[PDB]
Structures are given as C-alpha cells and as structure tokens.
Amino acid sequence: SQEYTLIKIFVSNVKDFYSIFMNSIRSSQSVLNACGTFFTDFEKGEEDLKNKIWNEDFFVKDKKVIFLGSTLKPETAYGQNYTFINPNEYYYLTLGFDKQNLHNIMTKEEIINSCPNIYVCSENSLYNLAYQGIIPLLKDVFILNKIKGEHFVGLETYTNISKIKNLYILPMTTIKMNISTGIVPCVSSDSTDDYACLEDIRKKKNYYCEKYNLKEEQLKNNSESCIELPEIGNNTGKYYYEKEKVSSYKDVKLQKIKEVLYKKQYFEGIMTVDPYKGMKTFNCRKLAKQNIIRNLDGFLYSE
Fold it and tell me: What family classification does the UniProt entry report for this protein (predicted)?
C-alpha cells in the first residue's frame, strides 16, 4: 500500500474548460444517438440539475475545476512547470469535497449543492477517492463527463504552491492508468522522467504543436530546482538524463533511474527553496505533505 500526495491543480481558463466540457457532451450524445458510460444520465424530474451543470456559471461561479495530480515528491511542487496527462486515455469528471475524512452516500441534488470542486481523475482512482472521503457516492459515482486526455492538452493550470502559474497540460504516454489519478505534476528540474518527456516535446515541437493544441511558446517554462545533491548540485533530473544517455521518455532504463534518483534525493538531498532552504529532503518530504494537507492544497491518497 503506497501513499501518494495529491496536489490540487486548478484550471486557469475555466471558460475554455467549459467549451471542452460541452463539446464532449455533444460528441457523446452524437456517438450514442442510436441508443452509455460518458456521463451519468439525468432522470425525468432532474432537468433543473442538468440546466445547473451544463451552464457556464457552473464552471465559472459555482465550482472550482481541479485536476488531481499525484506525486511521491511533494517537496518539489514549487518547481512544477507543466502538468502531464495521458493523451490516449479517458479521464473522469466528478464532484468532490475540499476536505477529506482524515481531516458520504448522497443524492444527486445533494452532491450538486454540497461539493465545491469538480475533480478530473482516472477511473482507477474513483473508488479509492470515495473510500477516503474526497468524493461521495450516489445513493454509483456521479460522473459529469468522461473526456480523452488529448482534449485537455494545452490548458493552462496552476497550484497554490507553484512558483509560476502558467502550467500547461502536456501529453505523457507512459503514465500508467492503474496507478493513482493518472495526472502527474511535471517538475523537470528534479525528475529525470519529467525532464525526458519535456525534452522530447521540445526536440519534436513541430510534431507536438501540429498534433495537439500547443504552440511552441508554451514550451519555455523553467522549473525551479528544489533539491541539490552534494557532489552533483541541483537540476539533478537533467544531470541523470545526460549521465545515463537516456534515449527518450519511453526508455525502459528510466524506471530504474527514476527509482535510484528518488532514493538518493530522499536520503542525501538538501532543499534549495522556501520555506525549506538548507533543510534535508528527508525531513522536508514529511513537512511538505503535512503543509499541503493542512493548507487544503492536497490530499493523502492510498490504493
């Protein structure tokens, strides 16, 4: 049983998120016309509810729109430059609470009146999220929509922890859909696979800007390095990418490199960012989790 820190990754342009949401509703009504898993169906007297949700105000006024990002290095969140999603896989939209159990079977109307946040997450996470009190169950999970990751690529996001607030969604095809929420904060300074993926997108920017709603000027975000290893310095993600001559972000040796770096940072790293300057990564790992959870910027998640 592995514990993850989920980070609230807020969408900046909620009006764009609304267009994406409504194109998805219309596409799914089109594909299922001959007739069902895209959104939970609305019953005869539930039309007040449908009009409340399928409404610009729902996304702009009523609810916050939050991708739940999963990380095992929450102490690096300040350096997040991008948000990674699997462009080939479906993500679910559902309503949830700002505060979980650690700090819920409900009717549809109650969920709408009681849940302040729209979460985007993988199918894998949903029951674990219910179990932990982050989302409720319908009196079985209330799905607003189901959208392929490709359609979110290019959206600008931010966190309350990140130094920069223009964290665009980028595609990462190596995210496994049976792990956590299938959304990963990109911290390219401190993670070699993150560095590898951003580097592959930078190197092949014509292909990516042609295939997705990306323009190459979205590809220039610096990640502030949060961790220095003595003997190496900071930007350890780059250091290992080069030292090991990583071939691509899909290089099978990244799995080992990822795990070797994770452990070395944990046991030997020194923090280089506020509010942890000079503290050992080993201690800040704990403090970062605690702070994020206390500040309502995230959750602790197990599966």
Answer: Belongs to the class-I aminoacyl-tRNA synthetase family.
